[model samples]
Target chain A: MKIATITGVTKSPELQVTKAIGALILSSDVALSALTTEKISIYIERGNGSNVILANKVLLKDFILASTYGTENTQSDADNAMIALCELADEGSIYLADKESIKITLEDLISDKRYDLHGIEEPQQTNNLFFFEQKSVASEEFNKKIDVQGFDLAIMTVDDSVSDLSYQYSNGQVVKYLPFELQTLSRDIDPIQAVLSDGKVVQGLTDRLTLPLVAVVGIEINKSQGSIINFVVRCLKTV
Target chain B: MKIATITGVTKSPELQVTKAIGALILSSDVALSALTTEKISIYIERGNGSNVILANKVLLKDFILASTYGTENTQSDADNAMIALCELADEGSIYLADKESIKITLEDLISDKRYDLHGIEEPQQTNNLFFFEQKSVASEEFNKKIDVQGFDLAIMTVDDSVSDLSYQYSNGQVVKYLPFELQTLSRDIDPIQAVLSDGKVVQGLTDRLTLPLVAVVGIEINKSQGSIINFVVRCLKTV
Candidate 1:
């Protein structure tokens, strides 16, 4: 399992508008090698506690290049590369959902990998852990949305055996947490400025700056990487 | 293994306000013999898909009596008994939760019994069935709330042997369903009026009626009755 932080979002300040390509740079702890050539998705959090899919079928290698931080690559250069990549993302005609195309965003700084992505090193693969349900829906405009509530974090499994997904409310009444899927608060992306990778400043870039979105790890995918996760879901409805 | 329907919610019409004891009568296919002397809760659904606990520690017999529909029992008489029960619920000092103590509400009419309450008679106890997550929380004023979204219906189990709580989103993205205990949309209660069971009319009694909330089945307790369910939860936090 790994964490990827949105390091930057770069957009072309061009007039053709169709030339309006955007770039998102993500800094990560692991190689992100597993994501090579694979189609991935970027989800942006909304103020309404829901999430929207920003981009899909995003070929990690084609758009999100894995470059390391070193003497050869300065932070400025990385930012530039991200901007170029955003433009590239748009150019490749990768499917970015909804009218507000470049709205991928995230909050907080967190880890990308670790069994206990929310805690210490060397934690057991499965412990006294719980998960929240990540629900998504498509809007009339066809934009995908998700709601990751704290209460969705319901199920708990002590050992891999005997998994229980019951939730007790504050009123001391008990109920079940719907079985959704498990996701980790993997990492935080750096706040992005609406500047061109070439250092061109743009107005309203932050709101339009949808590149620096947080990436949550789906445990099922993480299981191959030898990490055990709880919660599983399939399907997002149109609300 | 039983279903209870709120046949009515009756509140005493008095000036003292403290006499605002409300009654709720439920009709069930099963005798509700198991709930006898047992403290149970009633949940009212909100427009937001959340649910709130209207009453707690309600001894089934004391607050919700089990009377049969027979020649001696006319619908009007049943209504009257329910009203009497509502008063009894309040007078027993049974500890209703909020200021609108009698505002227990529900929508639709569903079964309170049958493993396949939603279907054929004598169906298998467990089949290809799914459930929605029921979430509840306390308002600042301490009113319990719950959200029973359709998407909360996530996990799937193939034989009791392999229980996989995984969900697949609409876009084909797969995730795990959080392990919460299972619950069923057991039954719905009838709408109530401000008119007392004794035929006394009161203004604004519908909103103030505070009774006839729906009854949902917690599968854990149902397990004893030989029914199997998925999804489980432990706690509801203040959102």
Candidate 2:
């Protein structure tokens, strides 16, 4: 991850945002024009906290806009202004979500400045991680969303001693998102079978259930790569 | 997810909100009685953002009573005002924690403005993805908080080649979050066997060992109608 320092602020000088786009528009691939006039969204720092629009997508368009006035002329000046915007991101500290490549210099697109875009990763082949549920059908594959009902949430595994562990959290008194660790921090997990509801349980799943809530998820870490992640989900909603 | 549009301002017209319930009260089951002239909490939209009172639980009592005025009036009037109140949620955007169905027209139990109570999610079943640590004596199961000592992070995985990889990020110079994809991003790290203290290496790590500064987490992508996620936790604090 490469880090650069912010130099200064640069705006069209003429392009002043008068009105407000008001609410956040969660649309990806916004038009460059959408950012001008009163529509410009000044960056707000609401880092890595759950349920915010910041972490979900690239807020500003990553392309340089065409302009008339620039530092060296039209092009280079526009480039510098763009760099300035990137610079003012946040000082004392700034968390640029994950990575997207940032190179600041005075170059126009035709003079695209690139990095060592090498040494990246790609599974030579694809691996499938499937989820299945049933009474007696061939456990088919599932994907989309995962549903959790209270204690039914705390999942456990102990296949490994090193990389298999649980990271848990709760609010004041209740546990909201929980994926438990039977052993350590990371590992392998096996598949599961079905159970009948006749063993019907009570609503208050002390192991941790709901008093009423929603969430931010992802307890996803497969002990390692190459190993197929195989596990079943039961008493869950759907794929 | 129950979205309601505000139609008009609702209130116990006569019962002016005296003082203030001030901040948001994560109350789930609220009673009409609880919403006194002052105790009514006008919902604030800390909306899905941080340092707010979300992630906390609260049920049916999702609505906050705004004491402007009220009447022993008919059901529809009260209903209209209630809907209006809902409308002003955080202005342009509102983050209503988890549940709370909204109705259009309205009612009165104590004036329980009800709705069709239709759609929702149910946890059909789920699976666990575990991580384990070492040591035997206790072999006890621990859940709850994780310890991130500046490390426990930086683990990289590169499984797909053209997956447009490196969902990366950074804070600065130290090279905080890195993914080195030599043959594969990271490694299919094997379960540790043993480590000699200071110069430690191991397969079985006993507590008093790997606990703090590290953490036990459930990297559970129960990926649906699921299976048992089995893995051990290494450096956790414990439930």
Candidate 3:
């Protein structure tokens, strides 16, 4: 039997963006460029009482481009330009899909004229702590235009319990528990069997099938300050 | 014996401010009506790759007014009145201080120049992370002003390590091993301890410690876009 406790849960809101690129033939009235595609940047504003966390990837297939040219005709032209750019730039027209269920294509390389783009603001530093999720994208390579997708985006709010315990806002909230087999890492040259036995003893005393071993929590202490405290108890039983 | 691993460390820079209020008769050349303390606001700009963290309840002290008006003989009563009015309108007198230093005051509050000040700019939030430091201020009343003779104040970064672990950074440097104690409230009960020791047939284990430890590391991960991977290995020693 094993036991684990749920000490804290962190929630965060998710935001994402995607772009498409292309080259257009300029007529007398329309402008055309020789470049394959133009880069389009996006900036999301942090609203009042609402902090936005921009994940690495973008989400959704639809892009809403707001521009000074309010007419539908301008918007359609921009959309067509973006699509043409995607088709021309994608060397093989292969679309890459990310874990978040978002798709990427070469069109993402084309700058959409409908939206005025801006560089991403630097991330704010705080003492909020977070735990690293073990699973992650290892690597990706693309030959032609690149298409990026994203998902699992969430908005996170402050947890008073963790905050009262000195967790910082910049410190993200994610906790990882070590298995008994890893306890020997704390000391030197201890046998794995011995470590397992020790973990069993603790598990037996607690009557937990999977003994609540050690785990780490992240916290942000201030705007630019944060730290991690160690060894919190987890008494839940797992069968 | 129970063992833990070291993660990484977090660090930041901050500025402290102090204000002192004093009582002094308005100088003849100084416009009494213009004698006012200015409202000072501080904005921290994150440089190319910098972030700011703020702690709560910064100590504030010593505020005084200085007058400079006596050298020139050509000045008339009106000139003096103008100087007085300028002083009255000049409200910028608060000075920022180093952390934990005592503030000095040389003048009292003026009739029209009195002002209230506080720390503004709410701390940034990430995934609901809120940073806080431990405090033991003597004053229970929030609005009362205190005189500074010399006060002892200690502010330390919050601790978030679970046990001892060597943490590595993205820059390739590694932090040496460090130890952390479990938070008090989450300790295990005797029954749980018994299961861990006897029923589980485990041995050489320290009395049960808790899970969900806070960890500190010297590395900062760019979590805004994706996840950062951290790894640790465990070893054991036998007699």
Candidate 4:
């Protein structure tokens, strides 16, 4: 299971990490997708081989979401507009495991009667797909809608911001996939190529690009620390 | 927004709670159904006026399930059969909020530098809709399939074990209501009333009862602590 510790909590005004709460972190090898029907037990280590479970059977599906930061908070209300957009970015200098399948017992989290800082690697920057775009005047509509309710001008991308369909077996028949399994259908087409008289070809002109037939359904902005945000988007097609 | 605490971890050999984790508990008013698109922040209170977030944006829907017990573990493996069956029963002397809308800030959880023991009623026993039955010789097939993968002989019910359809607005028009919206279509029906001699009537007899036309599709047995278990069932009707 991957293990991580809280170096500091991201604060407001400057969105910097300065304060230290009691050190606590989560270690589990399970993916967040299959969490609803799996076993990510919560345990606490007192000292010297006497580890007791803090709590388990959390029913976590009802109130949380992984964020561009570590994890996002969603316990107060279930509405999207009311989502608490506090993020867990790398500002805290938090250390994460190198491998996703790394294993560490509860004792590894504690040593010398304190949280151990050994056996660690820098937090992985696996989700650094795109940079945040800053708005001049700041978007009041987006601020009033999501992403800390204030820093809604930044734009970012999360893990699933770019996903593709897969070919899987269904009722003994493989499910059909879209044309290009690299990007979304809207971005998986061929570009126009222009041939000049001198046997030269020009490709990738913006005006001649193909557009998707689908319509934008929802656009979500999940803000990270400072000037950073993750976008979650969806589309629908008309009949 | 259901609030609960670690009363006791249901252990094996008797499936009884004979220990305690820390005094840590969760107090949030959120529903498990809409968790994927919502927020449920996690904050930790250390003494007075000092509250820091433990973790939030958990993406809980991927890892947890509301069970006949407090929460079932789903962090290790995402498969249904790998669900850990350790339960949180009433054995830990856990006191829950009396009303669903009750409010308790971080201060309410602490008083005089100790975890407050006040502002509590008994934990709600809202899931006691069914009892468990022991099977002879234990079903090895069920044990190999789900719910602790060992105690496969218990039977019980959870919240969704019994559900009904509702009429709601969708796409400007209200969705069609089923024959009877009280129970599932299988159980919502009119029973035949038999008439004997001298105007004697016999109502609600099993032999003359009408049966549903649907076929059972999947039967999932979720074992709770002890001989208790919850049943999650599905059905399908062929066109």
Candidate 5:
């Protein structure tokens, strides 16, 4: 008959080191000591509409041993554990797995600008790629309604200015000749508003339009636009 | 209908800090971020027995900026983003739902133990509760009736000491011993010889004797004597 026995353990001077090793074994089927370097590549896509390519690759200096362990029948425990570790690393949102591949989303490839494409562009003009342009102003009817309400008339005046400059059209109204030109209009709208609006208008604008009228440079013009115009001219609304 | 502008870009020496702030928003949902803290707790069950409890708890730490963007459908995006983040973190073994629920397996948990469990304990033996024991040894019989051939007997010897054990039995012979107590019966008989006995044996002793002594150290003996011996004697018949 074979006999087995447990031996007494000795504490190491480096508790963290020992604990790390132990944690590795306990956490995953694989274990290793010291820093292991992995070639982490940051892929870059070149040219417009070009596929993302790994450009100017650099070696990911060092990847310290995270944790390792033996094989497990179920992966929930390991996954949860990894998640917890990631959280402790202030990365609780992260996860890890075994025997399976990772599903990288736009979020994972942070360096890739393609995934960061949120909100409307500065010009808010449609590209040739068939992607619809995002309007910065609310619909003309909505803008006109808001203007009539006298809640925030500057929005319509500003849209009118931008429309006139950009030669953009609204309901029987041009986007130019307003207080700001297309270039100036692009600078005035808040990015948050742009992002919120996305394909529509006025979505992300809330954060940018917080300034009260009187405090603005040309406040009177915005306040008087509705009364000056006899016909109910709709301001260009972005939707 | 408030008008806003994007304004000029601001530059700071703390791009990393700025990126972090932006990344934080993009990486996690506002709702989930509000709910999640720097740390998270996770549990790991040993197995079906549920008797074995793991004392270790995993803590998540260190997170990479995954992704961030504005969504028209916050609810669906949040759900899908959370799921995608989870899948990314887990290397794709797990998937999360927009409802903030996760789907995982045992293998996934064990492999990603860092995010699954922190303080893991060695698994303990489980008694299926069905009350069953594995046999320590396998057995075979030696037939003396057949003519002895050139079979390798050295393999069965203990420490290169004895040949195959056999048994002999004639018309009139009396033996007294228990099968369990006959541990040192001088490699003289196989299990078949004991079973072929003519006389009746005691209740427990010699009732069940195994063969092909490979690694067995000892056996159990009952309180009876003469009957056990008679049974053994009659069963023995070596060529």
Candidate 6:
């Protein structure tokens, strides 16, 4: 039952784009080609703890699509609330769920243990939160213990440093984020050790260190004035 | 007088925290910091295959009052060496000797296996080194056998899901180890899968044939000069 995601239609026929889940589901490039009789536009998402958004201006009109989580019509009503919700755009970008509904932004989710389910449900809404942190560090340690002897100073260079992350979940919420660009990863660690450019030791790496499970996840949000209009989680494990 | 006191590790420290050996030796009677009392217990090891006795266990109380092995320098010997294997409820632990024949206790096969016997005996010194690596799970599929890509630091792509991994052989090895049920072991030449408690896939082990084992070996006792001396040994798989 995946149709266009429209949050609300305050008026008949003339509707405002509300939820942007459609943005994640549909990109600006395709919408124009598909909707033959009408004009379609999208606000594309790209980059950052910080970012830049290019609005959806199809025939100069702006539209918004929202996530199922953001829409009350996900389960849908017999009245076809969602079917009727999708349509022509207004001059401004879609207002989405509107001021009446609560917009849940992160609140210490990244640093504490909390739930991912947000917004309200009881009287009209409940707000639960989730968090994860994205980090990038120098990729390699500056000084490490000698390889065979067991410990001490050694160095290696790497491309961009990886983000250092600290994440926990449940009851606690709010994500923390940082951005990146790596001049390049270096193999030379400090001024004094043998450069590990060859990548030999990684082979048989008979010696192993099993890693621990992490609670952090990276979330991508593009449109903002502090409001997460469109977002996607950057996957840690590739599919 | 250096000996290992094995005990059911009641509580594991948070994975993100690294307690350096120097810090362990300086902790009060507990011999290590982060030692909290809870109901659960475990034995953890760090490093590759040869690293026996890897995790959930602590190699603290570094009489690293000095480094014991081949640093191209040599000083102390057996007479003043240490004596003791780690133990749970182990206190003051023990110390060991240099150049003297040494013995360590180990138990095999988790089934009905219960006998502390010698895994390694009377080795004169600890020298010559190599690397070992352990792997499992990927967001993206990988070949049956993984490949090598770095030197001393084997890269575990925690960012890319290709079934990600995060590692640290510096400061110390060993990540958090938890209780796993249904873990079985066997002896088959071809590698079969071992369903770890968390559902991570381990493709190559026949049944982790042996348990965690280490050498009071690799003892690097400097003749003098260089101040950065202490005991060194490869560690692994003690979970």
- Candidates 1 onward: DockQ, in order: 0.01, 0.01, 0.05, 0.01, 0.01, 0.02
Q: For candidate 5, give the lDDT of residue B96.
A: 17
Better candidate by TM-score, 2 or 3: 2
lDDT of 5 by residue, A1-239 (tens): 10111122221111111010001111221111111222222122223343322212211111111110011111112111111010011111112122211111111122211100001001112211100011123333222222222211122222332222222122333232343342344335422121010112122221112222221212212222222221111111211
lDDT of candidate model 5 versus the reference = 0.18
Q: How far does residue A234 in candidate 2 sit from its true spot (Å)?
A: 32
Instruction: List TM-scores for all candidates, in order.
Output: 0.16, 0.16, 0.15, 0.17, 0.15, 0.18
Fnat of each prediction, in sequence: 0.00, 0.00, 0.14, 0.00, 0.00, 0.00
Candidate number 3, chain A TM-score: 0.14
Q: What TM-score would chain B of candidate 2 score versus the native chain B?
A: 0.16
Per-residue C-alpha lDDT of model 6 across residues A69-154, encoded as one tens digit per residue: 11121212232211113221212222223232112121111111111121111222222121111122221343111111211111
Give a tens-digit lDDT track for model 2, residues B154-182: 22112221112222123322212222332
Best by lDDT: 1
Interface RMSD of candidate 4?
A: 30.7
Q: Comparing to the true complex, what docking class would candidate 4 get?
A: incorrect
Q: Which stretches of candidate 3 lie over 4 Å from their true place?
A: A1-113, A116-217, A220-239, B1-108, B112-114, B117-239
Worst-scoring 10-residue span by lDDT in model 1 chain B: B115-124
CAPRI quality band, candidate 1 = incorrect
Q: Higher lDDT: candidate 1 or 3?
A: 1
lDDT of 3 by residue, A1-239 (tens): 11111112221112233222121211111122222232222222333433222212221111111111011211114233311111111122112123221121122222222322221211232222111111111123111111111211111112211222122122333222222211211111111111121222110111111111122223222111232221211111111
| Model 6 lDDT, residue B212, Cα | 19
lDDT of 4 by residue, A105-212 (tens): 322111212111112121222321111212121222232122222121212222222222222222333333332332233233322122222222233222111222
